[PDB]
Design a protein around this nucleic acid. Structure first.
Ligand code: ATP
Ligand code: ATP
Ligand code: ATP
Ligand code: MG
Ligand code: MG
Ligand code: MG
Lengths: 606, 362, 97, 54, 433
DNA sequence: TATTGAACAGCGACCTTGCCGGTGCC
DNA sequence: GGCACCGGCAAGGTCGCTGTTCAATA
């Protein structure tokens, strides 16, 4: 038994407190049928484009009423950096090497180049069996070729050279009889060009003697056309080296000594046709965070080559020190699928030329291209004698001076006969190049580029022509990451002629008219191409491979009387100067949006 | 018809702009200056600091002085964006697990002071996840004043699992002043502290292996970067470059008890439901200004791989825009057609008071 | 003495009986459905927003044609630059040492 | 264009009181709560003035 | 009126437990803050939160809860609950302006609902309100038993709750939202006991299995199943305290529990003649220690769990002074005794509404085995098992119930008012059950 | 006069919801 | 009989793909 009146008198009373039955949140569903989105729909909304509209409008107002001397044009490379102002006739060229104090020299940390087993079963093991047999067969092929070409060959020739070389012995002169006086870098002297650290770049780095009271090491941040991760302990150290080298080039070659003034300048950076996106996004970061330049713009090496020429349509063969690359340019783009990138160049011809003469008892058997004076000697000898011109070949005698540091100068006579042509001819059978270690370290520090939103998908460029050349070396459901990792494990190598035709077939995409235009439009650039009769020899090699095109094939070196090294640079300068280029990433864009703005701004699908 | 406004306000730099745009129009220091014996905001307050006392109204990610905070929003609309808020809806960003009372006060202010017609409050970590292009992941968000780790699954954050490392970009600046004083320089006043903040942003980086670096720093020439002060004097800094960022990984180095960002990440994943963890290891997202040092992605990949089982696949997502990801995600969210069904209208505010933010900004 | 009368027992008991049988029951349904809805809204929204964030990177016909136009614009401008510098005979080099 | 589209999709945009009157103003006030034993105690609660209509 | 908004009453809901303590506001599907009950102690100051427990010279790990799941350290309890309810869930006071490097009572609006274990004694209940009403200025207070809130978190007014926590396994009958006192049954055979079983089983494999906790390994390399480990260890300029290593090993035991251990779910007990022999033939489970050491587990994964169902199966306690579990402490004996505490007419209703709770109930196969055992011991009745929760995330059951309770409009008449307390002092034994 | 930048017209692929329905609990 | 889960289906617009036509350049 219960009652309310008793409870009232006891002071007990159940009460709602004026509250709702529940204060749990009640949630309404979102409706999404036929949804729409305003995100980045208009040019007004995209920062990279907003800023360009404002810039265009300001220039039109300035017309109602930019200076090339404030534009720096940079083109990096495995041996050489070209740098200069867009105002200028020509870039200054400097070796892209940085020299610093260290415990051990280059020579002290690694085995000698070219590679030899100094203990082993005779010349055949010392140089390697396959290599010696390759050399023999190529020598036979040349003799057959000269005889077929109705030119004289002496029945024995090597024996005239080899027995001279191995018996000559050097001569010493420099204390008394007048040489060219070399001048080793005075590493103790303080820098005058506006900085404290005693680092060296360019020719002044190469001419540091092997022994000096502070011991100095040389570092190359680019080799074979990519970041030189093999030689570096850590990523941070490599970025700091590329930054130090470019910083010293601005101060020492351009004379831009006050660091505060650089914010007034703008930059054009040339990149290869098959770029690593990690390398592009490094160079942008140096130019905007470390140098604080106002604007940065990019152009591909083959695109720039045509701008140097004044060509609308061409096939551009770019023979470097260590990279060679081919692509077809038409209607203002490199044709994305045409791109081919081979890992050899004029340096391999130097190594191979030395190695062929060494086997033929070249007097200076102690030579090792990791020693500085040896490297300079080998490059000089290469440029003096290497020759694809078949007709001028003979037994010839010459001499060279080994101006080693702090030792009297040694003079060697020597002879050659066919090393001078067989080493260059390696472009048409690259198996003789010492490709054994090119791939070492190729993902040691810096990973493959992945798409920013989907990190198992590679975002580095790819081309049908390059995959056709990988398949040519190694015949080729897994993920894209695993497939890319398999391709990465094959070094891209192919004959030069085959690489061109493979590039052009993918360029044309099964169209004989497009082929018949491009094949009459071969343009050769890059320092490695400067070997005599390179362009005629490349034409002949394509003609004897494709009779269906043989009457139309035409190969031209350079463009408009430029030097083959600078055509790419000149092109990049024209791209700086011309009015229509909106390809500039401004400093304010990159501070805001980092590498995302490259995708908004370039003149190709990045 | 006009777009909504997106405001991302923090311990260091406030950011503001229009919904739909891919970057803010305004980025300015969250400083309020008052005359000690009129008020001033941002670079203007720093320029005339001699006649002023300066404060930050946001401390450790959380608003702590509202009278000063309202001067920042006033400056944002009328001096930075040049727009009248009564024409536009507004999106405000909010720190992970900031107090309920703060949501009510920022709601109160944008309606009663600025008359905005409709508005929404949004969790910073979730926006930074949208801007990285995914629905599920764990966000390490690290600003000037605080660092958070936030697991999010199918767009819902998991409050119980959020772990707040209370050390961030200012601490790493203070620490870099301290170790530069040990090298023989001096940087004690505010006019020097702003130099030392710039020195981080240009010169510091995260070591991949700290033992190898701090051993090899004895010999390395390359490490010793030089820098030019406003006075034209040149400093040089060496192992200070990586010792400053290393404090993210070893908070003992700057003298507090906490796990480094790799351990707080790991712990936060491991507080989640067992089935979800495989997805979070596959989606570790980095956000906020302090995550911008070179190398940080790699060291986080390594350090969490060392803690995780060998059978897990661990992935670090660090998109190039990540300093502004919290704002970018707000721009996206405020520019969808569906935003119109999300926001608090002024008509709901009139009906319900500031508590409406607990019903709608879920 | 407080809190021990038969009426106190009855009122306390009756409150908890109603609270458990009626209110807890309704609020559990509402709570579970509300959570389900909230989680769905957030799933949907995360899906749209994450698509938009990536949408700028997807190639299109229109974008590709505009890009081919920008490339062709610059390429003709470059040809015009060489017309002018040929018709005004640009010089470059001296190399004495 | 999509933002102009009539019907249900944009029911939010057309409802905005752009450049309109001041909203009513809220103050932390106090509410009286009563236990089942009759005792009264106070909780801070948001409050605003009424909205009359003649 | 029409002067008030959508605001009503923002309760705090607080749930201390031997392993974890949970706090947050009512009207939310999950607690905002959950921290280990194990606090750190260094240089005379206490430290809280899983982000703060880290190796330091003299670091000592302590717990404010005893294995009765009751408070035994009210001074530390005060500091831990101040850290949760004040420092992490209220607006911060700003720094003085001089310190920032530019210039050269707390709970008065949130009532508190607090969670107690169902055997928590009168003197401990009294001191919980005494601590609250002195320290934080809270407006009003309520204290309620985990079984009741677990039942509410499954939406049930009348239920049998099986609650396999850390320090204790509990069974209780809830009817019309109140505990039937005679039904309360409790047991050590729970999450902490199960870690003791696992440690014993590891110290008794053919090669002994050693656990090295996560903080002691710097780096590791993957190695084959059963191979020697391959890693390098941290070295410290100080002794690691035994207490700290014991807490940091518990995480590794929690991974083994959540991912390897399985209740035997098959027909009859695991030791019945065919079952053990069959279990050795099955595909196993793989596991890794922080060491990098990797192994495949087969018949053991059942036996470590089986002890709470059949006491005969249990490994020897690794601590020699620990009492081994008796038949009366096994889950079936608890259930049978718990229901024998209740009127016969009410048993079908309870058995139709079984609610399971606490993280040890998340063992693989636990619901299966519980369904089988209930079937075989109560034939002829419908058995149905519910989780406590609004979501798949079933860890916070007893907290969620508090968040629902504190959100119901009819509940606010119940809180013990600040005034109602200060007039009486001992009101909480009577004006609460 | 060939080529261009652009506005405009037309269509299908696509995601998402409401609808009608089978099967089911209560 | 009310309400619900799960399913196949008809249907709505936004968006990108395809295409015609125009004023303008040089
Ligand atoms: N007069 C010359 N005759 C023949 N070869 C030369 C001559 N001058 C330079 N070379 C060779 O040309 C090579 C290529 O130099 P170049 O500057 O084109 O290469 P790079 O662009 O620096 O490097 P990369 O291979 O990455 O393109 C030099 O390494 C050298 O071997
Ligand atoms: N490039 C960079 N490298 C290193 N640190 C950077 C860089 N850019 C900015 N920072 C640092 O980032 C911090 C600012 O980050 P952010 O803008 O995210 O702060 P915030 O969002 O206001 O902080 P919070 O979100 O914690 O309130 C500062 O310490 C700044 O020095
Ligand atoms: N996923 C899991 N599977 C099984 N057991 C788990 C899991 N996660 C944690 N545990 C264990 O369960 C217990 C978790 O604490 P739990 O919430 O269940 O108890 P509590 O409520 O904190 O303590 P008390 O026993 O006082 O109620 C610990 O013993 C822990 O090791
Ligand atoms: Mg080159
Ligand atoms: Mg921030
Ligand atoms: Mg418990």
């Amino acid at each position: 038994k219960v009652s309310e009146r008793v409870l009232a008198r006891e002071g007990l009373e159940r009460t709602d407190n004026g509250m709702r039955q529940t204060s749990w949140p009640e949630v309404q569903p979102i409706n999404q049928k036929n949804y729409y989105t305003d995100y980045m729909k208009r040019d007004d909304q995209i920062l990279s484009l907003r800023l360009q509209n404002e810039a265009n409008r300001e220039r039109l107002v300035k017309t109602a009423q930019m200076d090339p001397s404030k534009i720096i044009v940079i083109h990096p490379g495995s041996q050489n950096l070209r740098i200069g102002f867009a105002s200028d006739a020509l870039p200054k060229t400097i070796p892209m090497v940085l020299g610093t104090q260290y415990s051990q020299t280059e020579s002290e940390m690694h085995e000698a180049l070219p590679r030899r087993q100094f203990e082993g079963r005779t010349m055949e093991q010392q140089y390697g069996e396959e290599w010696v047999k390759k050399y023999q067969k190529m020598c036979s092929d040349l003799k057959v070729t000269m005889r077929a070409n109705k030119l004289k060959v002496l029945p024995n020739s090597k024996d005239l050279v080899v027995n001279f070389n191995r018996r000559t012995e050097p001569e010493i002169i420099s204390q008394h009889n007048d040489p060219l006086q070399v001048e080793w870098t005075n590493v103790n002297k303080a820098p005058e060009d506006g900085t404290t650290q005693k680092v060296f770049i360019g020719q002044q780095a190469l001419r540091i003697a092997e022994d000096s009271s502070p011991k100095y090491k040389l570092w190359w941040p680019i080799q074979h056309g990519w970041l030189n991760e093999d030689d570096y302990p850590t990523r941070a150290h490599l970025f700091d080296d590329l930054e130090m080298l470019l910083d010293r080039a601005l101060r020492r070659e351009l004379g831009l000594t006050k660091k505060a003034d650089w914010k007034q300048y703008s930059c054009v950076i040339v990149i290869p046709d098959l770029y690593d996106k990690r390398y592009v996004e490094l160079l942008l970061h140096l130019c905007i965070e470390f140098f604080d330049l106002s604007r940065v713009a990019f152009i591909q090496e083959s695109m720039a080559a045509t701008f140097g020429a004044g060509y609308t349509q061409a096939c551009v063969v770019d023979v470097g020190a260590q990279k060679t690359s081919i692509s077809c340019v038409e209607d203002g783009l490199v044709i994305e699928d045409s791109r081919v990138n081979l890992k050899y160049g004029g340096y391999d011809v130097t190594e191979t030329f030395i190695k062929m003469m060494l086997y033929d008892n070249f007097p200076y058997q102690d030579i090792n291209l990791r020693r500085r004076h040896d490297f300079l000697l080998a490059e000089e000898l290469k440029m003096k004698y290497c020759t694809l011109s078949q007709a001028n070949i003979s037994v010839q005698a010459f001499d060279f001076h080994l101006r080693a540091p702090n030792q009297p100068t040694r003079k060697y006579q020597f002879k050659f006969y066919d090393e001078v042509i067989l080493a260059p001819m390696g472009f048409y059978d690259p198996s003789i190049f010492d490709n054994s270690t090119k791939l070492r370290g190729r993902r040691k520090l810096i990973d493959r580029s992945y798409n920013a939103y989907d990190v198992d998908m590679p975002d580095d460029p790819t081309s049908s022509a390059q995959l056709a050349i990988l398949a040519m070396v190694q015949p080729s459901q897994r993920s894209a990451k695993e497939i890319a990792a398999e391709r990465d494990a094959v070094l891209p190598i192919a004959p030069l002629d085959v690489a061109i035709l493979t590039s052009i077939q993918h360029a044309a995409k099964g169209d004989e008219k497009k082929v018949r235009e491009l094949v009459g439009s071969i343009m050769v650039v890059g320092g490695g191409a400067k070997i005599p009769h390179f362009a005629p020899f490349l034409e002949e090699k394509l003609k004897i491979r494709r009779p269906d095109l043989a009457d139309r094939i035409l190969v031209s070196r350079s463009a408009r009387e430029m030097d083959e090294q600078v055509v790419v640079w000149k092109g990049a300068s024209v791209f700086a100067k011309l009015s229509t280029n909106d390809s500039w990433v401004t400093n304010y864009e990159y501070k805001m949006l980092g590498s995302r703005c490259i995708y908004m701004k370039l003149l190709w699908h990045y | 018809e006009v777009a909504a406004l997106v405001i991302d306000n923090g311990s260091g730099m406030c950011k503001a702009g229009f919904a739909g745009d891919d970057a803010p129009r305004a980025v300015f220091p969250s400083i309020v200056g008052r005359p000690r014996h009129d008020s001033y905001v941002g670079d203007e307050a720093q320029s005339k600091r001699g006649i002023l006392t300066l404060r930050y109204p946001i401390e450790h990610g959380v608003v702590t002085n509202w009278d000063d905070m309202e001067k920042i929003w006033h400056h944002t609309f009328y001096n930075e964006l040049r727009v009248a808020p009564e024409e536009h809806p507004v999106l405000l960003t909010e720190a992970p697990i900031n107090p309920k009372s703060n949501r009510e006060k920022m709601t109160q202010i944008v309606f009663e002071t600025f008359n905005a017609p409709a508005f929404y409050v949004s969790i910073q970590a979730v926006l930074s996840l949208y801007a990285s292009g995914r629905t599920t992941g764990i966000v390490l968000d690290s600003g000037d004043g605080v660092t958070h780790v936030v697991p999010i699954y199918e767009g819902f954050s998991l409050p119980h699992a959020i772990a707040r490392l209370d050390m961030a970009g200012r601490d790493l600046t203070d620490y870099l002043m301290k170790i530069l004083a040990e090298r023989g320089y001096t940087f004690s006043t505010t006019a020097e502290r702003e130099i030392v903040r710039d020195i981080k942003e240009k010169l510091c980086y995260v070591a991949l292996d700290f033992e190898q670096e701090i051993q090899t720093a004895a010999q390395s020439s390359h490490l010793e970067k030089s820098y030019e002060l406003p006075d034209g004097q040149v400093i040089t800094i060496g192992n200070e470059r990586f010792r400053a960022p290393e404090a993210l990984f070893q908070p003992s180095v700057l003298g507090l008890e906490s796990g480094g960002i790799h351990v707080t990440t790991f712990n936060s994943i491991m507080k989640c439901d067992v089935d979800v963890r495989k997805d979070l290891y596959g989606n570790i997202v980095m956000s906020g200004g302090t995550t911008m040092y070179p190398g940080l992605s790699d060291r986080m990949q390594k350090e969490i791989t060392a803690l995780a089982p060998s059978s897990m696949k661990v992935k670090i997502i660090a998109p190039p825009e990540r300093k502004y990801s919290v704002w970018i995600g707000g721009s996206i969210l405020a520019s969808l057609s569906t935003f119109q069904q999300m926001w608090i209208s002024k008509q709901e505010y009139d009906e319900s008071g500031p508590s409406i933010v607990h019903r709608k900004c879920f | 003495l407080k809190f021990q009368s038969k009426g106190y027992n009855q009122i306390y008991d009756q409150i908890w009986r109603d609270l458990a049988r009626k209110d807890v029951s309704k609020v559990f349904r509402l709570a579970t459905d509300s959570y389900a809805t909230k989680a769905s809204n957030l799933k949907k929204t995360a899906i749209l927003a994450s698509k938009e964030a990536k949408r700028w990177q997807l190639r299109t016909n229109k974008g590709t044609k505009d890009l081919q136009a920008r490339a062709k614009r610059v390429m003709r401008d470059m040809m015009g630059f060489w017309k002018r510098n040929e018709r005004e005979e640009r010089d470059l080099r001296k190399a004495a040492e | 264009g999509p933002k102009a589209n009539q019907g249900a999709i944009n029911a939010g945009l057309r409802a905005l009181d752009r450049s309109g009157k001041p909203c009513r103003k809220w103050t932390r006030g106090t509410f009286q709560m009563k236990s089942f034993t009759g005792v009264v105690w106070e909780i801070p609660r948001w409050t605003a003035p009424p909205r009359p209509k003649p | 009126a029409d002067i008030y908004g959508g605001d009503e009453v923002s309760a705090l809901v607080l749930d201390p437990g031997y392993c974890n303590t949970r706090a947050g506001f009512a009207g939310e599907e999950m607690p905002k803050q959950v921290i280990p009950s194990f606090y750190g102690h260094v240089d005379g100051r206490d430290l809280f939160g899983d982000e703060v427990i880290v190796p330091r010279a003299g670091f000592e790990v302590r717990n404010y809860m005893n294995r009765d799941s009751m408070v035994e350290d009210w001074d530390a309890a005060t500091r831990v609950w101040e850290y949760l309810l004040v420092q992490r869930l209220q607006p911060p006071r700003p720094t003085p302006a001089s310190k920032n490097g530019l210039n050269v009572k707390p709970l008065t609006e949130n009532p508190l609902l607090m969670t107690e274990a169902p055997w928590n004694t009168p003197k401990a209940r009294e001191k919980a309100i005494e601590v609250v009403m002195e320290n934080w200025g809270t407006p009003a207070f309520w204290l309620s038993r985990t079984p009741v809130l677990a039942a509410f978190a499954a939406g049930k007014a009348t239920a049998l709750v099986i609650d396999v926590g850390g320090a204790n396994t509990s069974v209780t009958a809830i009817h019309d939202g109140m505990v039937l006192k005679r039904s309360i049954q409790r047991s050590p055979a729970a999450g902490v006991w199960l870690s003791g079983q696992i440690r014993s089983m590891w110290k008794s494999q053919d090669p002994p299995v050693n656990v090295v906790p996560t903080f002691m390994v710097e780096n590791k390399k993957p190695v084959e199943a059963g191979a020697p480990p391959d890693c390098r260890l941290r070295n410290f300029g100080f002794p690691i305290h035994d207490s700290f290593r014991a807490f940091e090993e518990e995480r590794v035991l929690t991974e083994f529990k959540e991912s390897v251990v399985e209740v035997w779910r098959g027909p009859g007990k695991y030791l019945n003649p065919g079952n053990e022999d069959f279990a050795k033939t099955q595909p196993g489970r793989v596991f890794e220690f922080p060491d990098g050491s990797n192994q495949m587990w087969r018949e053991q994964r059942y036996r470590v769990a089986e002890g709470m169902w059949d006491e005969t199966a249990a490994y020897p306690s690794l601590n020699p002074d620990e009492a081994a579990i008796t038949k009366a402490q096994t889950i079936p004996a608890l259930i049978k005794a718990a229901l024998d505490g209740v009127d016969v007419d009410l048993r079908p209703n309870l058995l139709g509404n079984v609610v399971v709770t606490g993280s040890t109930s998340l063992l693989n196969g636990f619901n299966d085995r519980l369904n089988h055992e209930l079937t075989n011991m109560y034939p002829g009745l419908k058995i149905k098992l519910h989780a406590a929760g609004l979501t798949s995330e079933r860890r916070f059951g007893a907290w969620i119930g508090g968040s629902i309770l504190a959100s119901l409009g009819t509940f606010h008449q119940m809180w013990i008012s600040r005034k109602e307390y200060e007039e009486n002092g001992a009101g909480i034994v009577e004006k609460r059950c």
